[PDB]
Amino acid sequence: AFGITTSSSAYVIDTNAPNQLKFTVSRSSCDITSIIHYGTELQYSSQGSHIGSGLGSATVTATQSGDYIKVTCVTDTLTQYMVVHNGDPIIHMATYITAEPSIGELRFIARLNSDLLPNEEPFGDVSTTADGTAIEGSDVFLVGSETRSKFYSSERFIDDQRHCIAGDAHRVCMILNQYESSSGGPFHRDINSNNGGSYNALYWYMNSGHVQTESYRMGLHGPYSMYFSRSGTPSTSIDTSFFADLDIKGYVAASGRGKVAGTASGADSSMDWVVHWYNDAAQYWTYTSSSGSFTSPAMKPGTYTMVYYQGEYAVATSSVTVSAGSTTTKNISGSVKTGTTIFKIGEWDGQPTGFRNAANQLRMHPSDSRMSSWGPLTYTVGSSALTDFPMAVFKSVNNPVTIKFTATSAQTGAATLRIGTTLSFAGGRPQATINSYTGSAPAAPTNLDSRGVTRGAYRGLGEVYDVSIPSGTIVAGTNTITINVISGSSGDTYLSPNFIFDCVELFQ
Numbered sequence: 001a002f003g004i005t006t007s008s009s010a011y012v013i014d015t016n017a018p019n020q021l022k023f024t025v026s027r028s029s030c031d032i033t034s035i036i037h038y039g040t041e042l043q044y045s046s047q048g049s050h051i052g053s054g055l056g057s058a059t060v061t062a063t064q065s066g067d068y069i070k071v072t073c074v075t076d077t078l079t080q081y082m083v084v085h086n087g088d089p090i091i092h093m094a095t096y097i098t099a100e101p102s103i104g105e106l107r108f109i110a111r112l113n114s115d116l117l118p119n120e121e122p123f124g125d126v127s128t129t130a131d132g133t134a135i136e137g138s139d140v141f142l143v144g145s146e147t148r149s150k151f152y153s154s155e156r157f158i159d160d161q162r163h164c165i166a167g168d169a170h171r172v173c174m175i176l177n178q179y180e181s182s183s184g185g186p187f188h189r190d191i192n193s194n195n196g197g198s199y200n201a202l203y204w205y206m207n208s209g210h211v212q213t214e215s216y217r218m219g220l221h222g223p224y225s226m227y228f229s230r231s232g233t234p235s236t237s238i239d240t241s242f243f244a245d246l247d248i249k250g251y252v253a254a255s256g257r258g259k260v261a262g263t264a265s266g267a268d269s270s271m272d273w274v275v276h277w278y279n280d281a282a283q284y285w286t287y288t289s290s291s292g293s294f295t296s297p298a299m300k301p302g303t304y305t306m307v308y309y310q311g312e313y314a315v316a317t318s319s320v321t322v323s324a325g326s327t328t329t330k331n332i333s334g335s336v337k338t339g340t341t342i343f344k345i346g347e348w349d350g351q352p353t354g355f356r357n358a359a360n361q362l363r364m365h366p367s368d369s370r371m372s373s374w375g376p377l378t379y380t381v382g383s384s385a386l387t388d389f390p391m392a393v394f395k396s397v398n399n400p401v402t403i404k405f406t407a408t409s410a411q412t413g414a415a416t417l418r419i420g421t422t423l424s425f426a427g428g429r430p431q432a433t434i435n436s437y438t439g440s441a442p443a444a445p446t447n448l449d450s451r452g453v454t455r456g457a458y459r460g461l462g463e464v465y466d467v468s469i470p471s472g473t474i475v476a477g478t479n480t481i482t483i484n485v486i487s488g489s490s491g492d493t494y495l496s497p498n499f500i501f502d503c504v505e506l507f508q
């Protein structure tokens, strides 16, 4: 029956779902210590499913409110909520924090039986590290001759509404429709799952220091929902509005929110467009339609910075204020301006899309034998394909990148060489030489203090470096550009200073 079974050590919650879903919550730690779905135990027996690596000790309460049951777990700076609805095989959750956990990241981890749930969705075994030997830190491994990492299960948050682990008789998915308290914007990605050898972990990283570009946000994170199925795959359309009636700390209901609607215009129509709003309390985003129209998700009231991107490249920024129960009409427009182009490598989309190894880099390590050669490579404009230009240059692997190009007598005037990047590591930035002219050495970029290119990520601060080329330096005929990555830091192979390319353009 739908209900709560109380024992001195735990509360057992029965959702009364058709295919059965009951779970046990420790009254001492708030760990989920047992999960029974369709008569089968799914929880790893040696360590619980919980926030972080466990709350350790929490004050736990459980109550029924109509067709809902709420379990609340209070600690000094974090309150964890689990809510179930009679008849649904779902553990809905929300996590309220007044300070970031001591570890410096906020995650929920379900440690589930890997014999029953061996697979990872939607990316497969790229994040299966079971039987692997570490090749980088304790997070990238070699399984046979293939590189693997929990990071290779990652996805851009704007596109990560569902990820799961599964087997032939059970599937467990996270349904994520509320990233407002996370950090890093729509293009932040993070660890989603990892079959590591003892169990298969299913995660929601609410925030972390993994290629983090923003400060953390306090308040209520989520809701998020963990759905249990036999062989079905749940839709991401899951109503969690009932949280409004459960006195959930930090929960702002639909009635307390407003929206921003308008039309974005001017950017590159060959790219997807995204509008993003943020302030110290919350972040929101939406794709626009092909006509540029958009409507924001329901937003907490306040004043926000508003950004318009083509791909992940910001073309315009503005400010807007939202009030509860109202829609603020606000358009936004802009475009990427350069000049008369002599040559262009890649596109201004804030990504290394199209470059050599870019697709593989999201799902394997740069040292994987399946990667194409990193170089040093020579790209010749007019002959080389974009997949011959390295997605990244590392001071101690493929430095420098050489570009050869032909100019006409009409192109020998002053020009600007623009080297756009997405993410730096260990102070890497470009210094360019054009024929016998060397540009100045830029200062080191802001250090994000995080591995990234070796862990399937590329969304950094997007530093762009311009080099002014005087008239008469470009010559009619063949010209040579050398891009060296410079830095006072050092590292072994892919951990040497480096940066990922966005686009290189020479214009006048």
Ligand SMILES: [Ca+2]
Pocket: 346, 347, 348, 349, 350, 351, 352, 353, 501, 502, 503
């Ligand atoms: Ca690009």
